[PDB]
Amino acid sequence: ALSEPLSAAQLRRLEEHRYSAAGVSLLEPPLQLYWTWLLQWIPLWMAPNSITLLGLAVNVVTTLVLISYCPTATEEAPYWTYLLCALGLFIYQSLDAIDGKQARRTNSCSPLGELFDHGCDSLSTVFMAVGASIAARLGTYPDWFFFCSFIGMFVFYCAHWQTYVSGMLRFGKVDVTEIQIALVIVFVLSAFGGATMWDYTIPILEIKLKILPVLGFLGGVIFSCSNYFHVILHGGVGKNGSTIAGTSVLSPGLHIGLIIILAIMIYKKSATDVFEKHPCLYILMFGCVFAKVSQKLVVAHMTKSELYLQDTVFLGPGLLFLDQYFNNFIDEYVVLWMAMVISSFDMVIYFSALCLQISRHLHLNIFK
Amino acid sequence: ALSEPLSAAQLRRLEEHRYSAAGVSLLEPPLQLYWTWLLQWIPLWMAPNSITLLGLAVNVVTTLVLISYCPTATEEAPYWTYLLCALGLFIYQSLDAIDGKQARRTNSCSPLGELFDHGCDSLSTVFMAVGASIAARLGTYPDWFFFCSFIGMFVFYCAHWQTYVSGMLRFGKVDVTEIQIALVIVFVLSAFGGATMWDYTIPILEIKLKILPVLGFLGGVIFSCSNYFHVILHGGVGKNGSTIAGTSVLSPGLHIGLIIILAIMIYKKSATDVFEKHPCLYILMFGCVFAKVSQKLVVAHMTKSELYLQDTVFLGPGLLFLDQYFNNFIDEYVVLWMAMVISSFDMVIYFSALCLQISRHLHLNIFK
Ligand SMILES: CCCCCCCC/C=C\CCCCCCCC(=O)O[C@@H](COC(=O)CCCCCCCCCCCCCCC)COP(=O)([O-])OCC[N+](C)(C)C
Numbered sequence: 001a002l003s004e005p006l007s008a009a010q011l012r013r014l015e016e017h018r019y020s021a022a023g024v025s026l027l028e029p030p031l032q033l034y035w036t037w038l039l040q041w042i043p044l045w046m047a048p049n050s051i052t053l054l055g056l057a058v059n060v061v062t063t064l065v066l067i068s069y070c071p072t073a074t075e076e077a078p079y080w081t082y083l084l085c086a087l088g089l090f091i092y093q094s095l096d097a098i099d100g101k102q103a104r105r106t107n108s109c110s111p112l113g114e115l116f117d118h119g120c121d122s123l124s125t126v127f128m129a130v131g132a133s134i135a136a137r138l139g140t141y142p143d144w145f146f147f148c149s150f151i152g153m154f155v156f157y158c159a160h161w162q163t164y165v166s167g168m169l170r171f172g173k174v175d176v177t178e179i180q181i182a183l184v185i186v187f188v189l190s191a192f193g194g195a196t197m198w199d200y201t202i203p204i205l206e207i208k209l210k211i212l213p214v215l216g217f218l219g220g221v222i223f224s225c226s227n228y229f230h231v232i233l234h235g236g237v238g239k240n241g242s243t244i245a246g247t248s249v250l251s252p253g254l255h256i257g258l259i260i261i262l263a264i265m266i267y268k269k270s271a272t273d274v275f276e277k278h279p280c281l282y283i284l285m286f287g288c289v290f291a292k293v294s295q296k297l298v299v300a301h302m303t304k305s306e307l308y309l310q311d312t313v314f315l316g317p318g319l320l321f322l323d324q325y326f327n328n329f330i331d332e333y334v335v336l337w338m339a340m341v342i343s344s345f346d347m348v349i350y351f352s353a354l355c356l357q358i359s360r361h362l363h364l365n366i367f368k
Numbered sequence: 369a370l371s372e373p374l375s376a377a378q379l380r381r382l383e384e385h386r387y388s389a390a391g392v393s394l395l396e397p398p399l400q401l402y403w404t405w406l407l408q409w410i411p412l413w414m415a416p417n418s419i420t421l422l423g424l425a426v427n428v429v430t431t432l433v434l435i436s437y438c439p440t441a442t443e444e445a446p447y448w449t450y451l452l453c454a455l456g457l458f459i460y461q462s463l464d465a466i467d468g469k470q471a472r473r474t475n476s477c478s479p480l481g482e483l484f485d486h487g488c489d490s491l492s493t494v495f496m497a498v499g500a501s502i503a504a505r506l507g508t509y510p511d512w513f514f515f516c517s518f519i520g521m522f523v524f525y526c527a528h529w530q531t532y533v534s535g536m537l538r539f540g541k542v543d544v545t546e547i548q549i550a551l552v553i554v555f556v557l558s559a560f561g562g563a564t565m566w567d568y569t570i571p572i573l574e575i576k577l578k579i580l581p582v583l584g585f586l587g588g589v590i591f592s593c594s595n596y597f598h599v600i601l602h603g604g605v606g607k608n609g610s611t612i613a614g615t616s617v618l619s620p621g622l623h624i625g626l627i628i629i630l631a632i633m634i635y636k637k638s639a640t641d642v643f644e645k646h647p648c649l650y651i652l653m654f655g656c657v658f659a660k661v662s663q664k665l666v667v668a669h670m671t672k673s674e675l676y677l678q679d680t681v682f683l684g685p686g687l688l689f690l691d692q693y694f695n696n697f698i699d700e701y702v703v704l705w706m707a708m709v710i711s712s713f714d715m716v717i718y719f720s721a722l723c724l725q726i727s728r729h730l731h732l733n734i735f736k
């Protein structure tokens with residue numbers, strides 16, 4: 001059951017699926033020419049998934065180095081790692097636009113071209129949220145460093161939730177490019193100037209200035225989530241009011257609801273403060289868990305199937321829950337690292353098995 | 369979804385099902401004549417389910433009165449309620465044998481004749497375990513008063529688990545009649561003599577004498593559970609090694625495993641001692657939960673279907689878990705009573721809806 005996570009009929013609907021998108025906003029038309037200009041120099045024999053993997057690897061490595069120099073969020077790393085992580089984010093966005101575009105150039109358009117960008121994009125969402133939240137030094141306001149970061153997951157889920165009830169990705173007037181440019185702006189601003197300026201309050205209203213960008217982000221989240229939820233509650237494609245697989249429209253929200261609710265409990269209950277001594281492992285552990293859950297919803301909307309709550313990676317956070325349901329029976333930092341290891345292996349094994357099965361069933365190499 | 373817990377195809381397999389049993393042991397042949405002798409005086413127009421309900425009502429009322437005079441298990445009720453509860457147990461056993469036998473007399477043999485005795489028998493198992501454990505005053509050894517009582521559930525489940533992989537009830541050389549006569553013996557012994565004799569240790573080995581009957585019961589549990597598990601792990605009927613519905617043989621054990629594991633956690637974690645101030649509400653709450661779970665397995669083995677972990681009555685104990693996962697946020701006795709109310713209503717609603725649907729689909733009255 002490990003090496004065959006899909007059935008033959010699921011492979012048939014995946015072969016039947018066709019990709020579609022209906023998203024135009026403000027910041028793309030200045031960037032389309034730039035993306036094409038970086039595109040033509042790339043040789044045509046390079047596989048698209050190689051581009052995706054290169055971007056994800058660069059972003060993960062740079063954000064891991066930045067996490068290494070700042071495991072918490074109350075101290076400043078040297079500016080060179082801020083600039084390097086910003087360049088990693090920019091090259092990641094460039095390679096994602098390139099992979100979406102240059103892959104179409106060969107009849108490579110295939111469904112492993114997605115069920116990938118939507119896995120690599122999930123991982124990059126988690127890592128980018130952690131990196132942006134560190135660079136702004138949100139450890140002085142730990143609640144935000146939690147809440148904002150998990151909003152950075154939830155919006156993503158809503159976007160794919162939208163697709164699950166429409167079969168086509170609707171972007172909206174403010175979307176991924178705006179966040180990505182805003183985050184490279186905050187990265188280069190915390191790089192060129194000292195990060196201590198984020199502690200400089202405004203004399204107008206005595207606000208710490210770490211609150212203004214996060215409330216701008218929160219307001220944009222309100223716009224995008226209203227735009228998503230309108231068609232979540234008013235888009236019925238597969239039936240009179242249901243989703244593209246016939247499942248009730250409110251079913252996929254249970255997954256991200258359970259993840260966020262578990263995060264709330266393990267935040268609030270912890271007698272030993274796991275955050276104020278070691279964050280960014282907690283958010284990475286829910287990052288791997290949310291990565292598998294979002295990958296499952298990706299598979300669900302491009303292959304018409306019902307969502308399933310039963311997953312093995314909920315053994316990751318759930319372990320913490322058990323070790324918090326008792327007294328600390330094992331030291332919480334050690335069980336958190338164990339949850340890291342078990343969730344990371346289960347996510348990686350699931351994702352590699354999925355790509356291997358998709359490649360073997362279609363008799364196509366992962367790299368062409 | 370409340371008023372139709374079954375599908376049309378499930379009703380079809382229930383109509384297809386036929387009852388079978390292969391159990392003969394020591395204590396039945398002296399009792400068969402007695403049961404028939406009490407049987408012939410009963411008029412033929414009385415419905416079998418009326419007999420089942422009368423027995424269950426008498427047992428529940430008597431055990432509830434005995435619980436009322438001893439909410440804990442460290443004090444003695446007057447002897448008249450001991451004798452009354454013993455007579456209730458005996459008349460319950462008599463009416464169960466009568467309902468199994470005299471119902472066959474009309475083409476009443478129907479499948480609502482079971483999917484009842486196996487619901488009323490589950491309720492009676494829980495109530496009888498609580499009554500026997502009170503009458504022996506197991507509050508001085510609370511662990512036993514827990515553990516033994518939950519063994520009194522688990523064996524029952526194993527029996528039906530046996531049926532789930534063989535389609536026919538195998539009793540064994542020691543079975544329900546032995547327990548029932550032993551419990552009416554312990555009831556009349558604690559009635560005629562003072563219950564304080566259960567505190568009289570034996571000078572031979574300094575044993576409290578509440579340990580000897582519970583270890584005899586435990587040994588008999590070992591015999592019966594080995595007899596069940598041999599065909600659990602070596603009976604394959606519907607497939608090469610699977611169950612009568614094709615489901616893996618170890619799947620139904622997860623339900624009773626989860627119930628017992630939740631009971632273990634809420635026992636051990638409780639900072640405020642729920643037991644030493646108010647037991648017999650805790651065991652009754654897991655009694656209603658285990659009653660619904662065992663009723664579901666009854667439906668599963670006489671109507672070929674897969675077991676489902678998702679049930680609403682796990683909101684009952686689970687609530688305690690949540691109120692224990694935090695600090696006591698609400699006083700534990702009050703949330704335990706709330707769990708009582710919610711689990712009792714969900715179990716009663718499920719069971720009455722099930723019987724109503726079975727009656728309406730077959731166009732047969734519940735009483736004939
Ligand atoms: C920050 C300033 C605020 C002002 C503006 C507010 C804006 C927010 C408003 C509204 C939000 C709208 C978001 C919708 C996202 C869609 C999800 C999705 O699947 O798309 C993509 C995933 O997307 C990603 O790769 C990144 C996900 C971003 C969320 C994490 C940010 C949280 C960090 C917060 C930390 C802050 C720390 C404190 C602050 C210093 C999928 O990729 P694709 O579709 O295949 O790409 C091809 C399409 N293309 C060709 C167009 C490229």
Ligand SMILES: CCCCCCCC/C=C\CCCCCCCC(=O)O[C@@H](COC(=O)CCCCCCCCCCCCCCC)COP(=O)([O-])OCC[N+](C)(C)C
Binds near residue numbers: 500516581587
């Ligand atoms: C106690 C002395 C120990 C010595 C002997 C050890 C013996 C134990 C050994 C082995 C155990 C074997 C048990 C198997 C039961 C089968 C389950 C089942 O579905 O059958 C029946 C349910 O059964 C019931 O109604 C009652 C269930 C009894 C369990 C609760 C007792 C715990 C109390 C412990 C508290 C102790 C306190 C401390 C002690 C003072 C279903 O009913 P039926 O099949 O439809 O009926 C018709 C068939 N008939 C015609 C045959 C009637």
